[PDB]
């Protein structure tokens, strides 16, 4: 059992801190946003993460988990200091809060600290974190040493508590000098309870660990863009992208996962990380061709639903009504960041249509961000409504558009719907239904990468 | 037990036919190259495929496997006719020619199986050709089926008998559903544990084959770009591989950066898919990038070498370990070694190449490659022993990671080369092992 | 989308019915217990299964899931009829299964596919087939059917996850023409579970029936195997946990279910192991390994008392023991065959006072332990249940751990130090690292490790 | 790079020594059998291990691998001393291990790390420690050492692959100062095996010693487990192979080592399972599951004869049986504890003639069966060996398959039909699919499945 400090209280820090406490460590979770800290200390949780509330509560009442804004108390407490603060897009990749945390650790250090970069940060960030802390130690005459370590984060939004407790792997990057080898043993000790069956931890140098995180997200992004290009080609060949998915996923060298063509990828991670890796690379004088292509295919894909709609109803959608099913960038979250629904709704509104959107969870967040998106077009927002019931969105719709494959959308009341829409047309950005089931249900179906039914 | 005909006697047809026989079918293997057929009938095997000779022999002597050039007897024999001929962007002549013959001499209901890798919609052309030759005859029904091939060169017999999956594409009309049942019957012995077979429409089966090879190609090019980025960040591409392969969504396989991909399949298929797409008015951005990264990567060894010894390599000698496009084959098609050796030769160097298996094939293709430069060829030799290549070398270059190169006699070598320098296009050795062995190591995507 | 009927509303039927609905099927869930039906139709859930309430609710409001006691309506509804009723030892009581089978035969319209989901002895599907064919003969029936075996692989307390993301789905069918028809229907029904890897596994019905037993029997064998080695480790002075990692790292053996402790319990392993032994004796064969496995477990359930008696004496009058964990495993409230019951009885019989704690099974335990010990009112007066783990430790001579619920993994050893009489812990689950206990000043008695 | 000595030149020592050299260590391989040493120094290899010859050659010519009978030179050379000598019979014979230990103590210079590689009984490392500390007392020795357990997990005939790409490496060390020093040395030694996943697993020495036996005992249990269920399947009319797929698909159970058949043999499982049972009775505990496991195997080795006698009668005089497979498993020539030996004995004793075939073990089988049957010269005259699988079938009343060598998987059933007396096959390894046999006109008797006629 060790004393750990986590700096930052978002998905990464909140989950990491709570869960490391849950295995018997004494965790101090620090943040500067006093309201966030106040809310946590009053039994609330600022993020939609199944499991997280009960774990936080359990460990607070047990004396293992504390929330505060006391910077000095935080650095005093932990021998291991996790940097888990955010990294906002710039112009790409804003290191200010990370370096600020690093500075404070250097400013008030007593003895040997292990400083862990948990937040997703660009290769070499750990050297800047080391330079910042070594300096604040020079302004103090410090014969106290430290090592910076890379321990990236692999949590999926809305599945973060499971992903943390039952990880595929744990990546640790350490220097092989003497401080580094000391920090390494401490990480070994810290993560022991995760290595009791298969050995889940994976050791490397810090620059490799930093890199790994980006490459991992970049490959997952490539897989998706890959299938999306092929899906648009399938429409031309008359093939079925879903048959092809089973077809190539059955080769264990490729695997079955993340090959789901649709209306593109969004969220707080892929687009940021892909972009950041492309920039870093251009800055080192290298042009990532494949990743550049991957990023371009996605920007295009986010426009595919509008294209299909415009191709079917015309350039001018004045007088049309579209039901939108699903707003969040993926199911089981309320995160609207980079969500395909936002680009879709904008295009449609701009061409004169009325939109009735439904999402089991993201209604509020969507209303907020889409209002900001469209600030310069008040008159568009007047043609956008949110409804409380999936079927209600369909009232007088020329078509229903599915953009996030939430479970409730998989088995709808097609008869109740038949009584509501103007025409039984569905555009499907996630391939939820089997075309010929749609055909027999009398529905004009427009999937992505498969043949439709159109009757 | 059914009677099958296989048309074509290269890797795909030879292995397919022999192996389908070995499970009790009566296989007629047809080809027009009489010499090939003569060789097979005299116990020889025109391809380097472990296992294949014994399987062919076993089944010939058992009366289940026959080789001939008799077109009509072939068509007469098989109720299922596999088209397994070659496809030299994307030349359909031999496939259509086989299709015609089947139409020309058909008796009853045939199931025609496109096994050879062919572009989406090829099965409709094969259907049109055969229906026509049936109209010149007042004709009996048939269905064209897609059943792609997933054999790795040099491991083809294993890959056929214990497949990951079997892909079958059929129409859902009544001929098509009849062909389907026949395929079900034919492949029954492969479905006795897990159900290995996967049914779909024919255009999707055709597509699957290309997408699969294109995804594999992407994974490689992907890691190669990252490898060249690692060199700049000072990261270790191999650590990264472990780092991202441990995510089961990504997987551990085909993430080996190096000097690029080669051979008779990836380059052809990736190019073919790009063309077909442009022809349908779509530009595959990712795949084009993937193809461009590989053309570049095959030049990476030369670049590192020129960066270290200069633009003019006159008076240098390089040892080349590995010629074949990958280990455990003798196939020199699209092999990185060919681009490397050309570049080096063109800048004045002497080359001594070694490969456990491909020496003859390499000598042949490299002579053709460099026909216009006789004087280059005079500076190229092949040797019989890996260490001999090293005699007076300024450096040793590893381009194919055959097993014997994994544990070399670094002392014997030390007695032979001019300077202990190794460029490594496959990342065989651990850098610090090389450092302690006194060796100047240039890996791909790692610190040296 | 098909119309399915599920007969029985316990773990197997409730979860199976709700979850098959959730993928778009129209499910009629039938049971005779009107109170159970009434509770379900009023938004309640008679079992502790995470996920299950929301899935039931979701699908009721969507018109895909219905609960009733109307036998005839149930048979009329489903073309596929799941028998998921219970099978109470005896050894192995088929009455409710046969009774369900009869009703199906009694009111059948057209071709039915009858699916034995409940765990039933090899050849049960022939008895189900005989029962239904007869009721059809009392009716002059030119309607056909096939009986199918589709065993269940749900873990209590993880049943909803286990159903939706299964290792494999086992289907056993005849290869006559009715059977091959039922097979296609099962293929159709289970399609959505085969979209990545092919999860479904076809075989004959007797082999399917058998598989279920052999699967539980092999898991039981692994545990009893490690338990015997654990008691051997105490003699060699080795560490059973080191050995577990030692042999678990061979992929032929694997890492799971090798956790020695105070034995196995619950509503499945003991029943199924016993059943398979009986069936075998009835077929003139003595399963030696399984018999040994069963005997090792009966012994292991006494190990905690033995260790305790060896330390404090044959007469425990004047001693007090804290009991942490009552349920047969963590994350359930099921007290069936729970080691804690044999432990608590032994200890009470020798004069001790017991204070037991469990985060979930308090009520269930109080109920079953009262029945266990009905002949011994005076024993029960020496048994209390407490609401807070630490409270159990008040004046305890030792703390005994019998179910490794997560909250027990990181306890307040100082708070405890202020409460117990002596810092002694007997550990039936190996929760703690011995030398951590040593430095914490604690006299630790694990199973199969040095203390 | 370290200097290592390996004591003993059998599978364990030969492979270990050669392969540790192959990663750059300087290996001295010691043995007392001068002929064995002579054969190795002349490019020969006393064991059937694919890959081994080339590795040995490679490393000899490179100056990293040496074979000798010079005891003192051996002790002088290695700072790490692997005990890899044999452990024969009585249960579990420690004499050669203790003798090696003594020599190490007799001639030690500085700090040695002594590694018990050979499979030895729990607490053997204390006896090795006692023996060496004593020989140091007869010499007045400051010099310290630590005994370490590093068990072996090689499969016979696959030993080179299994060594170089291991599932895990098990190391047991004391946690005193000598022990922690030996631990670091082992960490250093095995580093090149930990560059991807960390393959090495540290524990105390008694647990390491135990691990080795439990691992074999669990593998043995799985097999006997399936064999009992196989015999129960015959009664229920179920298919044991369907059950295998049925329970293998549960990742908690896994797919491996669930092949019912005519039992387990070889130089390891029976020895180790027996040893574990004895040690246990000696510590006053009766291993019930293991005892049953051992009992089920002894019985299974008799199943083929039982099925044959049930079919043709108590008296097999005038019958002839083809035997396909002799080695205890495929890809080896090891006849130890092979099921074929118990089968052939039974059959011969009832008057039958036997024609046996094996692609590799013919010589070794002739030798051991002759010794098994020394007291029955007349039996051996009714036993022949043949060079071609099909020749065994000449006039056979039946063909019996006991080792599932690959060549048996696709036989010339027509060629055979022209040779045997009746088309009858008893299959102790379940090679063929029953209904394929049925259509081929063959009376098939598999283990734990329904047959034909
Ligand atoms: O860096 C991070 O923090 C995390 O980023 C991602 O997680 P996240 O963005 O929350 O969720 P994903 O499940 O990756 O969703 C990505 C987007 O791709 C889309 N997608 C996903 C899969 C697919 O097959 N097709 C597809 O379009 C999803 O709808 C979603 O919009 C990764 O999945 C995590 O492993 C990583 O730790
Ligand atoms: O279409 C076909 O008939 C076959 O082509 C390919 O196989 P192949 O070209 O024989 O050889 P691979 O083993 O795929 O290797 C191709 C190239 O990839 C390179 N490679 C592979 C993996 C890797 O990580 N890095 C890498 O550079 C190899 O050096 C090699 O030159 C596919 O792997 C087969 O599944 C397929 O059936
Ligand atoms: O037939 C059934 O319905 C189910 O029965 C069991 O599930 P369950 O009864 O919930 O309990 P398990 O999780 O199997 O645990 C069995 C007992 O063995 C004990 N055990 C388990 C694992 C172990 O390593 N050691 C050990 O002592 C557990 O504490 C528990 O008391 C099986 O695990 C399921 O696979 C099966 O579907
Ligand atoms: O202690 C040792 O030296 C070695 O002993 C065994 O290896 P081995 O003796 O070569 O034989 P195995 O391949 O393990 O099989 C042994 C016997 O079990 C039989 N077997 C195996 C698996 C199965 O499902 N059924 C079965 O009958 C084999 O046919 C053979 O008779 C162990 O597999 C290795 O872990 C260990 O390193």
Tab-separated table of C-alpha atoms in Angstrom, chain B residues 22-23 58 61-62 64 158 161-162 192-194 238 241-242 246 252 256 403-404 407-411 430 433 436, chain D residues 1 22-23 58 61-62 64 161 164-165 195-197 241 244-245 249 255 259 406-407 410-414 433 436:
chain	number	residue	atom	x	y	z
B	22	UNK	CA	-6.512	-36.301	-50.040
B	23	UNK	CA	-9.944	-36.109	-48.334
B	58	UNK	CA	-0.084	-40.527	-52.015
B	61	UNK	CA	-1.070	-43.921	-56.481
B	62	UNK	CA	-4.462	-44.119	-54.812
B	64	UNK	CA	-7.716	-39.999	-56.736
B	158	UNK	CA	-0.998	-26.330	-43.888
B	161	UNK	CA	-6.009	-28.189	-44.574
B	162	UNK	CA	-6.381	-26.114	-41.397
B	192	UNK	CA	-16.548	-30.850	-38.024
B	193	UNK	CA	-15.273	-28.766	-35.028
B	194	UNK	CA	-16.002	-25.030	-35.293
B	238	UNK	CA	9.455	-2.807	-31.558
B	241	UNK	CA	4.541	-3.063	-31.572
B	242	UNK	CA	4.223	-4.833	-28.271
B	246	UNK	CA	-1.515	-6.109	-26.802
B	252	UNK	CA	-0.127	-8.842	-32.539
B	256	UNK	CA	6.750	-5.981	-38.154
B	403	UNK	CA	16.017	-18.458	-39.358
B	404	UNK	CA	19.779	-19.158	-39.902
B	407	UNK	CA	22.350	-16.736	-34.506
B	408	UNK	CA	25.447	-16.009	-36.583
B	409	UNK	CA	29.119	-16.663	-35.810
B	410	UNK	CA	30.054	-13.068	-34.966
B	411	UNK	CA	33.668	-14.032	-34.364
B	430	UNK	CA	18.667	-6.703	-29.908
B	433	UNK	CA	23.529	-7.260	-27.708
B	436	UNK	CA	28.460	-5.348	-26.613
D	1	UNK	CA	27.544	-13.390	-21.226
D	22	UNK	CA	23.344	-20.361	-28.674
D	23	UNK	CA	22.486	-17.048	-26.953
D	58	UNK	CA	26.929	-24.190	-34.619
D	61	UNK	CA	32.593	-24.482	-33.913
D	62	UNK	CA	31.963	-21.056	-32.379
D	64	UNK	CA	30.839	-21.567	-26.961
D	161	UNK	CA	11.425	-25.151	-29.595
D	164	UNK	CA	13.789	-21.116	-26.826
D	165	UNK	CA	10.145	-20.035	-26.852
D	195	UNK	CA	12.336	-8.856	-24.029
D	196	UNK	CA	8.636	-9.024	-25.064
D	197	UNK	CA	6.266	-10.245	-22.301
D	241	UNK	CA	-14.987	-35.817	-28.939
D	244	UNK	CA	-14.267	-32.315	-25.723
D	245	UNK	CA	-15.311	-29.486	-27.984
D	249	UNK	CA	-14.768	-23.981	-25.374
D	255	UNK	CA	-8.972	-27.000	-25.317
D	259	UNK	CA	-7.848	-36.238	-25.994
D	406	UNK	CA	0.634	-38.130	-38.890
D	407	UNK	CA	1.062	-40.807	-41.624
D	410	UNK	CA	-4.703	-40.728	-44.429
D	411	UNK	CA	-4.152	-44.424	-45.228
D	412	UNK	CA	-4.645	-46.317	-48.501
D	413	UNK	CA	-7.886	-48.046	-47.472
D	414	UNK	CA	-8.061	-49.882	-50.778
D	433	UNK	CA	-14.552	-39.890	-38.292
D	436	UNK	CA	-16.310	-41.915	-42.999
